[PDB]
Design a protein around this ligand. Sequence first.
Ligand SMILES: [Mg+2]
Lengths: 221, 209
Amino acid sequence: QHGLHATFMPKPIFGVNGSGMHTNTSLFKDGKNAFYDPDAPDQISDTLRYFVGGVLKHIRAITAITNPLVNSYKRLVPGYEAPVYITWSGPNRSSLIRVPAPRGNSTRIEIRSPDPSCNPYLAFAAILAAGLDGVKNKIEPPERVEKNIYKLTEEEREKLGIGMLPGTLKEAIECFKEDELLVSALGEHVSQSIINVAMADWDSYRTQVHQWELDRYLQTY
Amino acid sequence: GSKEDEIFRIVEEKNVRFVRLQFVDVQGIPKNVAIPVGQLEKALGPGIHFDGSSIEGSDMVLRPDPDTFRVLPWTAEARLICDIELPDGKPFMGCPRQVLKKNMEEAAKLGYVMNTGPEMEFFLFKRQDGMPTNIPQDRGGYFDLAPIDLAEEIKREIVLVLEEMGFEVEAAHHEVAFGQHEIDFKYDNALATADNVITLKYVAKTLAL
Ligand SMILES: [Mg+2]
């Protein structure tokens, strides 16, 4: 109407910040906040750590749903607001999952990896299925990384067992293919449709000759 | 003198009609007085008078150095690097060439002689509407070869013109930045090298135009 164009693309411009969809998530069991425990340290319930543990276990596979475009992986690069390393921590340090200060009925986690181009119906279903699995199977999450990861060295990150999110759409789709929990939660029909559309885009994108290649090689070679 | 007789031989042989009495201001910018060949005897003898306010950035004499007589390879024209003296005959201590000569003479008293071999870097830019720009003529890199280095003919002409003026170059090559080049000079005394540096800048800018 105003002669403009609004876009929810993850990374429309190179060199600037990309658009993200940070999902503030809270689980309620029996009307009360299941993420709250007044007797536990910091006032965080066991259900919160098992939910976080479950999401982090399948986060590589969830990335195919929450970051579904080829362009989504141009947003998952260091130097910007977007998380790239698979860590969870407190509010002071921005990581993939961040547990803010508010307590009581406002106890929550914030999953920062998704982008606004994802299907919200499928993104929340994938987070619910992975989070509930960790609670059911009582999956303990890794240690909280309060130090910045960007300043840490590559060899140091390898010693701490810190992982990385998928670098390409094909890489996330390969991880999603093997995740039996998410394929069953989303159904064989939706899971196959996601794979088919993503690989059709990936096979078209990989064969293309982009302008960067002409700028880098045409004059010299 | 005989050096003077040598000059007049080259004048008749190459048909020199104009001579440039070159000199340099405190900032290193080349300045000159163009005189017809008829006044060359007057220049090599009592000298040509001019205004010394230009050297700063009001009356002095141009004293040509006979060893610096060179025919410009582009009727023919010739050049002569000049030292500045005051009307009475004393050397003008504001002349940069006379300053280097003094410092070299002091070093010579202690038996010391300094040899310099500079590595001259420069850029070759395009021209837009008769005015110079900072747009590289070529998109070349470090030690690149043609057609990546487009300025190979101009550099070839620069070194050829220098050799035709009693000047020997060690090597020339394309530098790191786009349109940047370097000409490495051979070793020589501080005075000859400084004369050579001024000549290179003049030749490179003339052939670029
Ligand atoms: Mg946020």
